[PDB]
């Protein structure tokens, strides 16, 4: 149980790019002396008479193992002991060897994985390997969770020719008492529960490999946590012995330039739904609130310098954009198509790709829109139009000759420069309820709002701002369309009341917003249920009480101070209380009489 040489592994599946020779050299360079593959092991497109002997050094794959479209006779993974299957091939496979043959049905004969004893997660699949010998004799039950071969091999089970390639059995022969794996059939032979492939003895220090984490020369279910439970305070303190996880290893410090997941693991880069920030002194991954930031070029910029409009051909390129550098221009030709360039008409529903757009730095010029839409719903999340464009007229917002009945620009809070023109929209109401000047950031900005539906005709039809709106007007008739609320709001909706004394989920009010009480707060009958966020601000706990905390269950095994665990029991009033220090697996009541 030591540190081992680590490599990254690949995620290319079945892609070929170069010559078989270049590809083979890439593999050789990658896995050279590699003992632990942090990712996947993809062995593809290796041809006959190529030497893959370096693969003999590989002992662990963290991801999946893919062996496909090879014609080489031998793949010598003789020392591969475990595939953890933390990533899957084809949505379900940790091990997949597929189609290792050419049109002559010649190819992979020898896959002597004589030390492969554990596949932690994932499935196994062998397909179309007409030259593969002996692997059909394997008893996979010993490995996966839920010539002829030597006569000495157990039940005719073997990975190859020799006695040395007889399958080693460490699970299915084990006594009924054993949790996990063994060295022999006796209850004396059982391995520690944390052992992965087999053991050299009964202890955590004896395991051949670890099921979860390796902290030094010991296997553990988890790494020493970064935070601790403090029984005196019922709160969480920093752990001075805490460690982060790096692959299946516990480490005091991440390698460079790695970052730390919320899960406390060391990774090279944060995930796609996340952003990075260093707080505090640690480079951390945090999940994005809303769509992750993404700047895209607008119409008349870069690749779109000679593009008339948003249209069928370019629309999907705005997918996930949150800020547009430059303009968005939408013109009648978008919806008509262009027959001469085979530009199809824009599918109206594709316009909802623009729902992620919160900012446009230039101008928003809308001169056409599908007639069956009643508002500019695609731009319901647009917050700012900066109007910085310097060579395309005076208007930063144009809404011209459309069929809409409301603007629906629910999130719009600033038009920093440029004039606004809203003209010729014969069904359009609500536009005069807005004090446009309050949106402006530049002296003298102007509006030109005319030849829309008449204000008096709108009033007479009931097309007015909702009763729950403030006097600041609205973007449509709904309580979500108000510029601001009469009083309280729940999310983006102006509402007549928060669920203080009645309704579910129960709430409190914070700066005129209805905020949900914590789920552990028990709803009170015609009386408030909480005074603030979280499980310490409840009037009454729904289940158990742990100090100031309303909790779902009492703490049971959590890491405490002095390198100990914390166990608690619940009394008749549902209050949590410390177990006696010597009930190291928990208790049902106070004292030694609590842990018989």
């Amino acid at each position, epitope marked *: 149980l030591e540190e081992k040489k680590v490599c990254q592994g690949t995620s290319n599946k079945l892609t070929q790019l170069g010559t078989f020779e270049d590809h083979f050299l890439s593999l050789q360079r990658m896995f050279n002396n590699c003992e632990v593959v942090l990712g996947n092991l993809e062995i593809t497109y290796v041809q006959r008479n190529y030497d893959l002997s370096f693969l003999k050094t590989i002992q662990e794959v963290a991801g999946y193992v893919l062996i496909a479209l090879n014609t080489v006779e031998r793949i010598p993974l003789e020392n591969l002991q475990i595939i953890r299957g933390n990533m899957y091939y084809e949505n379900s496979y940790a091990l997949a060897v597929l189609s290792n043959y050419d049109a002559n049905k010649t190819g992979l004969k020898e896959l002597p994985m004589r030390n492969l004893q554990e596949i932690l997660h994932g499935a196994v699949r062998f397909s179309n390997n007409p030259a593969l010998c002996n692997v059909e004799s394997i008893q996979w039950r010993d490995i996966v969770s839920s010539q002829k071969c030597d006569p000495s091999c157990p039940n005719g089970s073997c990975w190859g020719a020799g006695e040395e390639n007889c399958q080693k059995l460490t699970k299915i022969i084990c006594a009924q008492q054993c949790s996990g794996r063994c060295r022999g059939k006796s209850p004396s032979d059982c391995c520690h529960n944390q052992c992965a492939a087999g053991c050299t003895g009964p202890r955590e220090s004896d395991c051949l490999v670890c099921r979860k984490f390796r902290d030094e020369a010991t296997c553990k279910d988890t790494c020493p946590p970064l935070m601790l439970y403090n029984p005196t305070t019922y709160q969480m303190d920093v752990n001075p012995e805490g460690k982060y996880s790096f692959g299946a290893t516990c480490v005091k410090k991440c390698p460079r330039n790695y970052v730390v997941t919320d899960h406390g693991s060391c990774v090279r880069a944060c995930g796609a739904d996340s952003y990075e920030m260093e707080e505090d002194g640690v480079r951390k991954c945090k999940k994005c609130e809303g769509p992750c930031r993404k700047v895209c070029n607008g119409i008349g910029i870069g690749e779109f310098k000679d593009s008339l409009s948003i249209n069928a051909t370019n629309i999907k390129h705005f997918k996930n954009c949150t800020s547009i550098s430059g303009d968005l221009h939408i013109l009648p030709v978008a919806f008509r198509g262009d027959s001469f360039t*085979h530009t199809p008409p824009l599918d109206p529903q594709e316009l909802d790709i623009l729902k992620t757009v919160k900012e446009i730095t230039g101008f928003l010029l809308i001169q056409a829109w599908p007639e069956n839409r009643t508002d500019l719903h695609a731009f319901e999340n647009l917050e700012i139009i900066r109007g910085r464009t310097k060579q395309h007229g005076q208007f930063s917002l144009a809404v011209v000759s459309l069929n809409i009945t409301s603007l629906g620009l629910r999130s719009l809070k600033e038009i920093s420069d440029g004039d606004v023109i809203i003209s010729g929209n014969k069904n359009l109401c609500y536009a005069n309820t807005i004090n446009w000047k309050k949106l402006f950031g530049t002296s003298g900005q102007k509006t030109k709002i005319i030849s829309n539906r008449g204000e008096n005709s709108c009033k007479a039809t009931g097309q007015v701002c909702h009763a729950l709106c403030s006097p600041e007007g609205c973007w449509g008739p709904e309580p979500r369309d108000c510029v601001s609320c009469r009083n309280v709001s729940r999310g983006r909706e102006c509402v007549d009341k928060c669920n203080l004394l009645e309704g579910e989920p129960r709430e409190f009010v914070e700066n005129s917003e209805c905020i949900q009480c914590h789920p552990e707060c028990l709803p009170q009958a015609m009386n408030i249920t909480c005074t603030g966020r979280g499980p310490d601000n409840c009037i009454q706990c729904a289940h158990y009480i742990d100090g100031p905390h309303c909790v779902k269950t009492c703490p049971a095994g959590v890491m405490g101070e002095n390198n100990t665990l914390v166990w608690k029991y619940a009394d008749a009033g549902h209050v949590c209380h410390l177990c006696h220090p010597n009930c190291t697996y928990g208790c049902t009541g106070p004292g030694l009489e609590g842990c018989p």
Partner: antibody
Amino acid sequence: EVQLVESGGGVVQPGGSLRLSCAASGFTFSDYDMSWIRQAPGKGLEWVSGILGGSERSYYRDSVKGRFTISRDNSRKTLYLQMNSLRAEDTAVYYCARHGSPGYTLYAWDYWGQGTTVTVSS
Amino acid sequence: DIVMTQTPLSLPVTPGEPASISCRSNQDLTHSNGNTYLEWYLQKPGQSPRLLIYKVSNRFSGVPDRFSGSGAGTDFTLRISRVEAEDVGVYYCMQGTHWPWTFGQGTKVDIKR
């Protein structure tokens, strides 16, 4: 029904000028791209020019470019081909044709006019 | 321009019998978007041209299944399973894939006697 009725054809000297008209009815004209196609005495069909429904862009066959101008007046549902600097090789029957498949996803033309004849000789 | 070659240029046909017209371009007609804009038009005597087939093998509305098209790349064929007397006229293949769009010279189908 959809109709396309052409006029304006006639006889003209080399270097002279004519203007063809194509009057549309029975559909919303401004929703459709339009083309002119011609057929000389001994040849097949030859595409000459095209324009978008709202005139945002026009297209011309090279041998015609700079001598012909395509245009449209959507308020009168009418398509035009202004022909100047007329050469002998321009003599043909000229058709207007509607791009029935918007954005040419399927096919180039559905409806055609009845044709108008242009003869250029001295 | 893409040259479209029709063979034959003259086709007497016996009514009730099959007929076939070949169209070959001097350049592949597969567009970058994946479609092949190869069309057949028929010009009946005293009438304007009218679309028969589009995208190689699709019959325009109103066109009977006696007409079919096939082919790919640079090689195409119009087939009439049984010719009717009302089918006489001039058939044109047409390419809308590359600029400028072009027609073949036209195959005149008439009556065999």
